[PDB]
Amino acid sequence: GSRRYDSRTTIFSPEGRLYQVEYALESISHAGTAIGIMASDGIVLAAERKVTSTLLEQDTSTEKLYKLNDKIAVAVAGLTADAEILINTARIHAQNYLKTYNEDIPVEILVRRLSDIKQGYTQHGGLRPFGVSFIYAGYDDRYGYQLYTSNPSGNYTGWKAISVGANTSAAQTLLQMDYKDDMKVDDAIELALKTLSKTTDSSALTYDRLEFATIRKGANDGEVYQKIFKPQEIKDILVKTGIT
Amino acid sequence: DRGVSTFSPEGRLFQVEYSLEAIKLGSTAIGIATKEGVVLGVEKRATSPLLESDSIEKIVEIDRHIGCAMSGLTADARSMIEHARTAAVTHNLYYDEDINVESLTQSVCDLALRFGELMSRPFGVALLIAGHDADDGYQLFHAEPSGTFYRYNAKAIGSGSEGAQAELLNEWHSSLTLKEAELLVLKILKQVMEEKLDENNAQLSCITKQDGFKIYDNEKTAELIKELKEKEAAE
Amino acid sequence: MTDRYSFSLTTFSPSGKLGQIDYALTAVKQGVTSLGIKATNGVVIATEKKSSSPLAMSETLSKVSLLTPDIGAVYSGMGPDYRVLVDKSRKVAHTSYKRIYGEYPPTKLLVSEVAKIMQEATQSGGVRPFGVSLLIAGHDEFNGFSLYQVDPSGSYFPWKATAIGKGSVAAKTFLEKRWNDELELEDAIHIALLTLKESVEGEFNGDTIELAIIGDENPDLLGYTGIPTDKGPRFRKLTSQEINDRLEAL
Amino acid sequence: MDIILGIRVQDSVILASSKAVTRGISVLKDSDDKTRQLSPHTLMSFAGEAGDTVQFAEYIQANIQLYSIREDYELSPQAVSSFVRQELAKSIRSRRPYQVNVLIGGYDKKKNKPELYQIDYLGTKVELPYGAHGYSGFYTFSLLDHHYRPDMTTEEGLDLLKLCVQELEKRMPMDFKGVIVKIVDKDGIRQVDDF
Amino acid sequence: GYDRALSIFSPDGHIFQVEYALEAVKRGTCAVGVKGKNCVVLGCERRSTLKLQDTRITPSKVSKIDSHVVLSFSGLNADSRILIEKARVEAQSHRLTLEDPVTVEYLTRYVAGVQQRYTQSGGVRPFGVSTLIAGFDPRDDEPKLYQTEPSGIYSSWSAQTIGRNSKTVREFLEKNYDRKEPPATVEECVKLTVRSLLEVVQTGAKNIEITVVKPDSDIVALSSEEINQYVTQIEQEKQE
Amino acid sequence: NNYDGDTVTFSPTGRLFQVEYALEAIKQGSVTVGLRSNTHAVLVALKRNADELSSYQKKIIKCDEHMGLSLAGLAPDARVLSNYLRQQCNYSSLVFNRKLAVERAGHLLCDKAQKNTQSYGGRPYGVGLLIIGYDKSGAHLLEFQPSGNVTELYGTAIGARSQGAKTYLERTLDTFIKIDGNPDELIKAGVEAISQSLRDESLTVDNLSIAIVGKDTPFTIYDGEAVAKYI
Amino acid sequence: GYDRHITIFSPEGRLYQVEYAFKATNQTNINSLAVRGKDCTVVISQKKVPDKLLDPTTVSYIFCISRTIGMVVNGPIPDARNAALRAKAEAAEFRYKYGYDMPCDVLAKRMANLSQIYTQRAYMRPLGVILTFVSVDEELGPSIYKTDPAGYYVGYKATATGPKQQEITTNLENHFKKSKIDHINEESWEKVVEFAITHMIDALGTEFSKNDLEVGVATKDKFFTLSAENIEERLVAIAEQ
Amino acid sequence: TGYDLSNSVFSPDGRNFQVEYAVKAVENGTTSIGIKCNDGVVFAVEKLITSKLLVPQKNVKIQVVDRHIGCVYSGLIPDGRHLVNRGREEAASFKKLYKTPIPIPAFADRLGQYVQAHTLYNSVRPFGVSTIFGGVDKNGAHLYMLEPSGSYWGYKGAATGKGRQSAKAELEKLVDHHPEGLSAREAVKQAAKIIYLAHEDNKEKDFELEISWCSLSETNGLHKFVKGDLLQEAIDFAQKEIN
Ligand SMILES: [Cl-]
Structure with a gap:
């Protein structure tokens, strides 16, 4: 029968590892680097695009940074199509919570839900896991500014600064060196771009290669603003920090 | 790989035969039937001295007139016990009477071969089901994961079983008293156990018509162990 | 008489590769060349009509397909896989959009829906991925003209111009030299015909080439008059004669 | 179940609920507490069809207590009231709807404000300075329209509530056997034992 | 649906998927449980490979199942959430129908039953998790500490450890824990728990988490500075 | 070899190995004999014990007042198949007020066994059955094999050493068929037939199991001191 | 090498089960041909009855799908009949739902889409057949549309299928290169059948008796197969000029 | 290699080896035949007497479908019964909806499509029988033979099982020597002879002859078993021809 052709995607190895999760993480290690840095007055999300071509329409393009609601955004590392399945589920969960309680979803609750979906694909159903790691950047009135990551295992953890995708070992050493707790958004912007500038496999870091975003509580009269940077605005912040 | 319900060339189900190997690795359980009652005893086998041994529940009540001892993957027994209890109570609800020991055993054994590609594998545990009813009197049954059950005058299961069974072969007779059967279970358990037998690492129980199924106190079993030591030293 | 293939047939290998997706991309590489170029006032998509026999009527086989009145699609790879995707793409444009909002979806969202269907064939039980890459050109009121590529993984990217299939590496280089942000639609058609001539071996004419545009509204192709807001389809497939006219000024 | 009242004052919410349980000809009980604590700073009173009332109240209680353990956090009164409303709005188009009307009195610890929500069996939610379900409101709303001020103390709120109960004891046909009164404030929920 | 028998017997009578789940537990960070005369303490390891963490918002290792019962674990973190959620739901369901909170033994028996079910159900793998479940029964002052594992067996322990290098800390506890006279106070019990973790942890106070559970729903988590005082006192006595 | 992993696979010579392996489980089972005359039909079964402390495994199962079987192989599979026969006998009685024909009972068992040999996931039945009965066309004896093949016979035997009893019956055919009204x-004759399949062990009081059905005789099982007469 | 057993991609981007289904197509060792007239569409196929014990009237690979649509199959008869029954059901259902007769090209598309599903879904095998659909369509006129185990389909001016398809194909190609038209310029279907048989004789290099051929003819509003005696009349006319 | 391990897999030839392996089970079985006559059909089968203990005339192999169709098969006997059970359901639903009894060509395709369906998936095994069947309908007599692949054709004479070559040779002589046709009573006699001649391939164990027939004149177009004097007359004719 059909048993012959079953890869068995949800089993332990003799060492007690999940084969498919480990191999999915190997896939993610080749994806473009994404960095999240959390400051006292905001969060930065910076990410490197993978497909440099002069003919790619950049201003209408979105492979890395996605909006989940007005308060929460994600940076993607891995298969973009897999990520969009999960993103649309997370957008729905947020609106279900808003409909039920008449309050915006707390960041951790959204993260846990997505992380539980990923977990399920490793324990039952016989399907391959999602080849995606997320950096979640968000704000709520309980914990304020929060950074999380999740990976194909369905495990999630909180961070002051973090990287996913390619060259994370190198990236995390550089962040651990220059990060301080009293840091601000403008300084964190500079740190994010400098870290990508050194870890990048490309010859030079340019505006056409980056997706950039900030979550500030520096809107008019104590609200929170999500800014997804336009190409010209990424070009300006590259000149300002002194990279180009 | 290969089917879960596959026959071997000798005409045996692979998974059933492999579950019998799991049962050999389990702790020893012994049952002896008499005209005064049926005795059930087990080796507890704590993995460490910090483990509170009284929480090791390898002897279990099914109804007032039916007790049960287990050996093998003891976690698998919980759903079998749950089914046995429900079957016993349900039959009392439908018929206003105690359920026969054989019928209860048969109901448990009907679960056994419900596996395939229903549950994904056979049970990895054998049961000694002991009880009393008005029709066939005091009875002891051995329920396997094959779906087969045999009645026994006496039976040992688990790691020391073949050694214990040969000893039960010589010692059992139709005129055994209940007191004699208690000592005989303690004797044979002490023989096959790795660690030295005492009230904390071994447990006795019985089922009589008058008092029903009773798990023995550690203080009561301790006296029977002391009585055993003296009678063996006596010759 | 059971579907027992409830498990994934695409899995991660030790190196992190999804083998079936890579192999699907290889099938796309073997397929005939197709391209897309975006102008200021339009978009063009084009491909070769590789006829399997001269007895076969190549007019009946449509490689360039209307999805909505303002959106068109072309492919490289396995033709039957493309055909069923066009059927599903047309239907999902109605079910998940037009029957809700009373208007056709914008290009990017229809692309997103097609992408979703292709992703699911990359993860669901008992199926292989689609062996095609699509080029989807379209127009909508708020985004303007656009051109998208969709791969077997479900991933999609917006392009100013690109090519896929057989001679895509050479064709993409040719387009990099010729493309600028001030191109008119006629200039983009001219560049499309020049680019496509390089990858074609045999005959090169209106009968062996399939080309369509997303351009101005065509009220003459609408089929009715009396509603000022309905101005006609922006999708138009160029005729055999219309292609040959432009090949003389080539 | 007959009379449930609620009044929101300066720094607290007071709920008053009748003690009688009557089946047909006989008053079976005269000490029934028609309320459940949903969280430490949120109390729900209820009235409606026999059986449905308690089943619904305990079901909501279980769900809010589950949320509290999972997040190690107390939902705001507004959030609890929206959850309750959705459950009732779902219920009304079921095979057999919950015939239960509720008042939710809570103290929001974030905003430092008392809040009173009135929700009927259809899922009709309103936030109010004072509320009532059933025939009670026909007598008590006019009173409260006259005597209520937003800056009243808890003691003034209790006196205003005595004036409501006296009016109901004078003019309503059913003997509702007095009321159990409970206060919800910054310090939690407590029962006024003498009323 | 995906029906494939993943947990099956092998010729030697072993279920490899269950045994390989125990290896996932062996990999997990160390967790320890010690019960005193009038308390239970749950100690947990935090691996210091992960710095630049946010300790406010990171999932804590000890989880409240109800106001009177706690659950810690060793193994796969994602798997543990599924057991914790099911246990939390069952705790409220028990209150709803029995009008009484769960006993610690009952909650353990439920979690253990879920773990067992995943060893003989089609299309699923076992949980790569062992748990320590601790607390006090309602209106009872006797301390309770139980352990569960992927197979579904459970049992009661005077003291117990699970996870990486649990062999070493179990060795320590077997010689240092006296049954005739357990840790009489909260101080004595926390000290013995920290001492036992200091055998394996090989770092100061950031890598140790302590949670004290007392009768009548009195659960509190110790801070870094409070734990660091125990670490200081243990090593100063050791220098002799 | 490569073609014995499941019941859905033919071998290159057109064989179904899983079915043949199930057939092997019957040969390992204890011996049982069936025979009949024109008036009566008899089952004789040698029951097997685990050891001297154990009981002897029951071999004969009653299906209706006029029909029953003896088993050899996996006993739980005999329980499943006998339960199915009990239900089909019962359906015939309740719906049509009709005792189920023994020939039709065989056809139903055949078709039930067959479905397990053609579909994936399932396994063949691991047991052989001897069905006796008395219906509107007199006494009957059937042999069931879990391949699906069912055969009507004057006499037969199945199990370990069953060839000995089967030869005796082949010689005795002309004698025992004439034993009418006795x-x-x-x-x-059945007890003498099963004796030809014995080695070392002999027929004791709790070893032997006999059943009979006939003209004015319901299906009744004899065990214990009830069979001491025939030893 | 389980990528050769089920319909998943090999490293080369190939589906081996589809390719092997194409080889099953020629198992019968039969050649078919289809051509278009002015008013008609003719399909001819070789008929081989090796066993004397066979009833020759029941041996056929031409099927009447609907009143207007005929289908000839190249491939084994079980798969041919599977395809025939489904096409009949699909044609009838189409008429019921949409109120007009299913066009030849639309039925071809539908059957091709079904074939595509078997190349993408693992539990279903491809059918080892090539299906040549013929009609005189009320909109498009004389029509030939052909489907294969890949789920490919296309319209044809004329076509051929079988072991010696290339020899027949080139013969037909060369005729249409001379005439410079997409069809057989002939009024009666009888003469179009005579053309079809003649050009198969030339291409295969074999003579035919009445029992060696099988013929199907589509006209406006009906498709029908010829009897042995109707074919004999055709063979006499070919020989006499 | 590995192409023969799973049903519905094409080999590089374009063959389904599992179906070809099912044919080997058919070739292993006893001989069964069919003869088309003037106004009907005759079926006959070889039943091997494994033992004296087999009750004569009791283990009936030929099966009726509806009241007008006879079915006989060689190979795995239970697989044949499963196919006839389905055939009976197909004939019943046809008669339920359309009133008239199922025509023989219609019935042939119902079996054909069902057998063919068991070559489409790896979750099922092909049928291990070749089935000879037929009867009388409104358009006259029809004889068919159906293989494990689902393949079937109409026949003047048909044969399958271990003695098929011997039988096929004898049937071919009848077709040549009787072009105008064979009578129903003649076909019964000839069917007996052919089974007796085909028994030389299974000559170790003695056998039992079983015949059935449908004929417009002799049975009113209904399926009946040949019994008593007419059976013995056919046995005597067969015994005379071998000697
Ligand atoms: Cl379709």
């Missing part, structure tokens, strides 16, 4: 002599 149940004790027909049982004697």
Whole structure:
């Protein structure tokens, strides 16, 4: 029968590892680097695009940074199509919570839900896991500014600064060196771009290669603003920090 | 790989035969039937001295007139016990009477071969089901994961079983008293156990018509162990 | 008489590769060349009509397909896989959009829906991925003209111009030299015909080439008059004669 | 179940609920507490069809207590009231709807404000300075329209509530056997034992 | 649906998927449980490979199942959430129908039953998790500490450890824990728990988490500075 | 070899190995004999024990007042198949007020066994059955094999060493068929037939199991001191 | 090498089960041909009855799908009949739902889409057949549309299928290169059948008796197969000029 | 290699080896035949007497479908019964909806499509029988033979099982020597002879002859078993021809 052709995607190895999760993480290690840095007055999300071509329409393009609601955004590392399945589920969960309680979803609750979906694909159903790691950047009135990551295992953890995708070992050493707790958004912007500038496999870091975003509580009269940077605005912040 | 319900060339189900190997690795359980009652005893086998041994529940009540001892993957027994209890109570609800020991055993054994590609594998545990009813009197049954059950005058299961069974072969007779059967279970358990037998690492129980199924106190079993030591030293 | 293939047939290998997706991309590489170029006032998509026999009527086989009145699609790879995707793409444009909002979806969202269907064939039980890459050109009121590529993984990217299939590496280089942000639609058609001539071996004419545009509204192709807001389809497939006219000024 | 009242004052919410349980000809009980604590700073009173009332109240209680353990956090009164409303709005188009009307009195610890929500069996939610379900409101709303001020103390709120109960004891046909009164404030929920 | 028998017997009578789940537990960070005369303490390891963490918002290792019962674990973190959620739901369901909170033994028996079910159900793998479940029964002052594992067996322990290098800390506890006279106070019990973790942890106070559970729903988590005082006192006595 | 992993696979010579392996489980089972005359039909079964402390495994199962079987192989599979026969006998009675024909009972067992040999996931039944009965066309004896093949016979035997009893019956055919209106002599012939399959062990009081059905005789099972007469 | 057993991609981007289904197509060792007239569409196929014990009237690979649509199959008869029954059901259902007769090209598309599903879904095998659909369509006129185990389909001016398809194909190609038209310029279907048989004789290099051929003819509003005696009349006319 | 391990897999030839392996089970079985006559059909089968203990005339192999169709098969006997059970359901639903009894060509395709369906998936095994069947309908007599692949054709004479070559040779002589046709009573006699001649391939164990027939004149177009004097007359004719 059909048993012959079953890869068995949800089993332990003799060492007690999940084969498919480990191999999915190997896939993610080749994806473009994404960095999240959390400051006292905001969060930065910076990410490197993978497909440099002069003919790619950049201003209408979105492979890395996605909006989940007005308060929460994600940076993607891995298969973009897999990520969009999960993103649309997370957008729905947020609106279900808003409909039920008449309050915006707390960041951790959204993260846990997505992380539980990923977990399920490793324990039952016989399907391959999602080849995606997320950096979640968000704000709520309980914990304020929060950074999380999740990976194909369905495990999630909180961070002051973090990287996913390619060259994370190198990236995390550089962040651990220059990060301080009293840091601000403008300084964190500079740190994010400098870290990508050194870890990048490309010859030079340019505006056409980056997706950039900030979550500030520096809107008019104590609200929170999500800014997804336009190409010209990424070009300006590259000149300002002194990279180009 | 290969089917879960596959026959071997000798005409045996692979998974059933492999579950019998799991049962050999389990702790020893012994049952002896008499005209005064049926005795059930087990080796507890704590993995460490910090483990509170009284929480090791390898002897279990099914109804007032039916007790049960287990050996093998003891976690698998919980759903079998749950089914046995429900079957016993349900039959009392439908018929206003105690359920026969054989019928209860048969109901448990009907679960056994419900596996395939229903549950994904056979049970990895054998049961000694002991009880009393008005029709066939005091009875002891051995329920396997094959779906087969045999009645026994006496039976040992688990790691020391073949050694214990040969000893039960010589010692059992139709005129055994209940007191004699208690000592005989303690004797044979002490023989096959790795660690030295005492009230904390071994447990006795019985089922009589008058008092029903009773798990023995550690203080009561301790006296029977002391009585055993003296009678063996006596010759 | 059971579907027992409830498990994934695409899995991660030790190196992190999804083998079936890579192999699907290889099938796309073997397929005939197709391209897309975006102008200021339009978009063009084009491909070769590789006829399997001269007895076969190549007019009946449509490689360039209307999805909505303002959106068109072309492919490289396995033709039957493309055909069923066009059927599903047309239907999902109605079910998940037009029957809700009373208007056709914008290009990017229809692309997103097609992408979703292709992703699911990359993860669901008992199926292989689609062996095609699509080029989807379209127009909508708020985004303007656009051109998208969709791969077997479900991933999609917006392009100013690109090519896929057989001679895509050479064709993409040719387009990099010729493309600028001030191109008119006629200039983009001219560049499309020049680019496509390089990858074609045999005959090169209106009968062996399939080309369509997303351009101005065509009220003459609408089929009715009396509603000022309905101005006609922006999708138009160029005729055999219309292609040959432009090949003389080539 | 007959009379449930609620009044929101300066720094607290007071709920008053009748003690009688009557089946047909006989008053079976005269000490029934028609309320459940949903969280430490949120109390729900209820009235409606026999059986449905308690089943619904305990079901909501279980769900809010589950949320509290999972997040190690107390939902705001507004959030609890929206959850309750959705459950009732779902219920009304079921095979057999919950015939239960509720008042939710809570103290929001974030905003430092008392809040009173009135929700009927259809899922009709309103936030109010004072509320009532059933025939009670026909007598008590006019009173409260006259005597209520937003800056009243808890003691003034209790006196205003005595004036409501006296009016109901004078003019309503059913003997509702007095009321159990409970206060919800910054310090939690407590029962006024003498009323 | 995906029906494939993943947990099956092998010729030697072993279920490899269950045994390989125990290896996932062996990999997990160390967790320890010690019960005193009038308390239970749950100690947990935090691996210091992960710095630049946010300790406010990171999932804590000890989880409240109800106001009177706690659950810690060793193994796969994602798997543990599924057991914790099911246990939390069952705790409220028990209150709803029995009008009484769960006993610690009952909650353990439920979690253990879920773990067992995943060893003989089609299309699923076992949980790569062992748990320590601790607390006090309602209106009872006797301390309770139980352990569960992927197979579904459970049992009661005077003291117990699970996870990486649990062999070493179990060795320590077997010689240092006296049954005739357990840790009489909260101080004595926390000290013995920290001492036992200091055998394996090989770092100061950031890598140790302590949670004290007392009768009548009195659960509190110790801070870094409070734990660091125990670490200081243990090593100063050791220098002799 | 490569073609014995499941029941859905033919071998290159057109064989179904899983079915043949199930057939092997019957040969390992204890011996049981069936025979009949024109008036009565008899089952004789050698029951097997685990050891001296154990009971002897029951071999004979009653299906209706006029029909029953003896088993050899996996006993739980005999329980499943006998339960199915009990239900089909019962359906015939409740719906049509009709005792189920023994020939039709065989056809139903055949078709039930067959479905397990053609579909994936399932396994063949691991047991052989001897069905006796008395219906509107007189006494009947059937042999069931879990391949699906069911055969009507004057006499037969199945299990370990069953060839000995089967040869005896092949010689005795002309004698025992004529034993009409004499149940004790027909049982004697069955007990003498099963004796040809014995080695080392002999027929004791709790070893032997006999059943009979006939003209004015319901299906009744004899065990214990009830069979001491025939030893 | 389980990528050769089920319909998943090999490293080369190939589906081996589809390719092997194409080889099953020629198992019968039969050649078919289809051409278009002015008013008609003719399909001819070789008929081989090796066993004397066979009833020759029941041996056929031409099927009447609907009143207007005929289908000839190249491939084994079980798969041919599977395809025939489904096409009949699909044609009838189409008429019921949409109120007009299913066009030849639309039925071809539908059957091709079904074939595509078997190349993408693992539990279903491809059918080892090539299906040549013929009609005189009320909109498009004389029509030939052909489907294969890949789920490919296309319209044809004329076509051929079988072991010696290339020899027949080139013969037909060369005729249409001379005439410079997409069809057989002939009024009666009888003469179009005579053309079809003649050009198969030339291409295969074999003579035919009445029992060696099988013929199907589509006209406006009906498709029908010829009897042995109707074919004999055709063979006599070919020989006499 | 590995192409023969799973049903519905094409080999590089374009063959389904599992179906070809099912044919080997058919070739292993006893001989069964069919003869088309003037106004009907005759079926006959070889039943091997494994033992004296087999009750004569009791283990009936030929099966009726509806009241007008006869079915006989060689190979795995239970697989044949499963196919006839389905055939009976197909004939019943046809008669339920359309009133008229199922025509023989219609019935042939119902079996054909069902057998063919068991070559489409790896979750099922092909049928291990070749089935000879037929009867009388409104358009006259029809004889068919159906293989494990689902393949079937109409026949003047048909044969399958271990003695098929011997039988096929004898049937071919009848077709040549009787072009105007064979009578129903003649076909019964000839069917007996052919089974007796085909028994030389299974000559170790003695056998039992079983015949059935449908004929417009002799049975009113209904399926009946040949019994008593007419059976013995056919046995005597067969015994005379071998000697
Ligand atoms: Cl379709």
